[PDB]
């Protein structure tokens, strides 16, 4: 697909940041190496459900004033194409497949089959969690349902699973045409307190490490590489300075389009014609 | 000022950037916000859920 690393990072960082900040022992583990007073002051101010201060995330160049006490500024950077395929063919498909998804589901009995229901039509099934079927189990997929023989499996009549699958758009042939790009985004934790900037740096590094395992950047946005700048005053001529430490996140990812092929051939036919010269 | 309002900010109140002495105008996508539907305490803004 076409991709937007900045909007991915914003969407991914915001919930993760919230869920760490609402959970005191995570911060208590992340900041174990800092000075005791720095740790306790940060945990008192920003952390837990009762926290009176708050962190914020957003893109650069807003028209309004931000929470300069603690704010992650996201800042889309450079990139370049790095590797190309022969014919620019990144892949080919017989059935137009959408995004990868993971969904929780439960088995139910139906007509002496077990079935799992999924919210969308299954374009491909990658994994039913914790199950490997035998041929006897007569595994079949149909529409948005996975179906599974009941006879030997009655103990599992309400078994709970996670389905990893991917959507289908439509039944069509085509070529995925495109290339790989290596692209940079900068993130900086702004604070007018230097110890807050240093803690926001630690929290962001933890978040990015945790992010490396996510399906989003396992399937796309691969090879996350991190670089770190000096701590410096970002703005120097207010009533106080604003400090930050930049980090650069670099990703390798595919830019591509679905070139559908309308041509289809369903019968050869043969004829002999005679040359009398 | 402008703020996006979310469940946390409803429950906890928006901490305002400025030390507001008084409000001269307050509005949302649905129109003006009437004084029974907002309150300021301790430089926090509380809104009707």
């Amino acid at each position: 697909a076409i991709t937007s690393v900045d909007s991915y990072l914003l969407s991914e960082i915001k919930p993760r940041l919230n869920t760490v900040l609402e959970n005191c022992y995570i911060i208590d583990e992340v900041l174990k190496d800092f000075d005791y007073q720095t740790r306790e002051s940060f945990k008192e101010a920003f952390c837990g459900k009762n926290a009176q201060h708050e962190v914020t995330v957003g893109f650069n160049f807003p028209k309004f004033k931000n929470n300069y006490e603690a704010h992650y500024l996201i800042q889309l950077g450079q990139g370049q194409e790095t590797k190309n395929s022969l014919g620019s063919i990144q892949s080919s498909y017989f059935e137009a497949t959408g995004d990868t998804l993971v969904e929780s589901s439960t088995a139910i009995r139906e007509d002496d089959k077990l079935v799992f229901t999924v919210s969308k039509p299954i374009g491909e099934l990658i994994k039913v969690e914790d199950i490997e079927f035998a041929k006897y189990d007569n595994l079949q997929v149909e529409g948005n349902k996975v179906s599974f023989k009941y006879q030997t499996n009655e103990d599992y009549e309400n078994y709970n699973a996670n389905i990893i699958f991917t959507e289908k758009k439509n039944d069509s042939k085509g070529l995925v045409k495109g290339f790989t790009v290596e692209e940079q985004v900068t993130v900086v934790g702004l604070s007018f307190n230097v110890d807050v900037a240093r803690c926001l740096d630690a929290v962001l590094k933890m978040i990015l490490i945790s992010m490396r395992d996510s399906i989003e950047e396992q399937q796309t946005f691969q090879l996350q590489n991190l670089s770190f700048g000096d701590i410096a005053p970002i703005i120097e001529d207010g009533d106080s300075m604003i400090f930050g430490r930049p980090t650069i996140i670099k990703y390798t990812s595919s830019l591509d389009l679905d070139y559908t092929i309308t041509q289809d051939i369903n019968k050869l036919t043969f004829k002999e014609r005679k040359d009398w010269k | 000022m402008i703020y996006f309002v979310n469940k946390d900010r409803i429950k906890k109140g928006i901490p305002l950037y400025y030390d507001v002495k008084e409000i001269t105008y307050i509005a949302t996508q649905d129109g003006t916000v009437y004084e029974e539907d907002y309150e300021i305490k301790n430089n926090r803004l509380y809104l009707n859920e």
Partner: peptide, 12 residues
């Protein structure tokens, strides 16, 4: 210089 960056309550 004006107090924009860090903003504190009025004394009363």
């Amino acid at each position: 210089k004006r107090e924009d960056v860090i903003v504190l309550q009025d004394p009363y």
